[PDB]
Structure formats: structure tokens, C-alpha cells
Amino acid sequence: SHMCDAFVGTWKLVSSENFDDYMKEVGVGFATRKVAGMAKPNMIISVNGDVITIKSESTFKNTEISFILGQEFDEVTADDRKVKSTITLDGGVLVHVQKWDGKSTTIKRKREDDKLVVECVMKGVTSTRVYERA
Numbered sequence: 001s002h003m004c005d006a007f008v009g010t011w012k013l014v015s016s017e018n019f020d021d022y023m024k025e026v027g028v029g030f031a032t033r034k035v036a037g038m039a040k041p042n043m044i045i046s047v048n049g050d051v052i053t054i055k056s057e058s059t060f061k062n063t064e065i066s067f068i069l070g071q072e073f074d075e076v077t078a079d080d081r082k083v084k085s086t087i088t089l090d091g092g093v094l095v096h097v098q099k100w101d102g103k104s105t106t107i108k109r110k111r112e113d114d115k116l117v118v119e120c121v122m123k124g125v126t127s128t129r130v131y132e133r134a
């Protein structure tokens, strides 16, 4: 076992708050915000050795990232930002920091009860996205 075990599985979005506002803060344009905000993604998280894979799948975009904790990688986000990402585990929270164009956003994922809660922060704006097991 590893502590990241509680994240592994197939998850489906059950609620969202403030995601449009988060996307505005990140710089996402109108049409992408509308289509991305309508998406009902499934998140598939798996671990193989030291490599964690997170897939996001929806009618808007299918993405896949694989990474080792603490080891920077380059990522193309669903909204087509080219970012440099680093993901760490901080007291049981997966903390994903994305840097681009002198900007930064942080995505935190944690288990709470039977949920996987995703908190997306860009400056003072937070969106909370709740996933449950599929």
C-alpha cells in the first residue's frame, strides 16, 4: 500500500461551484468557458511504481498526465495553456502547481468522506469541484 491509494480509481463530477469565475481568472475565453463549464468529466487516477497518471475525460476534452511527485513536467491544459507543472503530496493533499506567462494556479485534490474534492485557485478566486466514485 501507499497513502496515494485512496485517490486511485474512476471518479465522476457531482458538483461544481465558481468554475466559470476560476476560468475567467485563468484567462479562458468565452466559448471555451461555456463548453468546458458544461462538461461532466470523469477523472481516472492510477499509480504504477512511482508514476501517477491522471486522466480527465469529458465531451469537451480528454487529457492525460503522468508524473513523479516533486518532478516538474510540461503540460498542455484542456484550455490550451502551455504550463510547467509540479505535483507534490502535502499532508495527504495532492498539490498541483501550474506556471505559465508569469502566472500561477494551484489545484488541490483531497479525499473527504466518499468524495474526492478538487479546489482550483487563481489569485483570490477558488472553485470547488466534487467527484464521487463512478
Ligand SMILES: Cc1ccc(C)n1-n1c(S)nnc1Cc1ccccc1
Binding pocket: 023, 028, 036, 039, 041, 056, 077, 078, 079, 107, 118, 120, 129
Ligand atoms: C480545472 C482542472 C484542473 C485539472 C483538471 C482535470 N481540471 N478540470 C476539472 S476538475 N474539470 N474540468 C477540468 C479541465 C479543465 C482544466 C482547465 C480549464 C478548463 C477545463
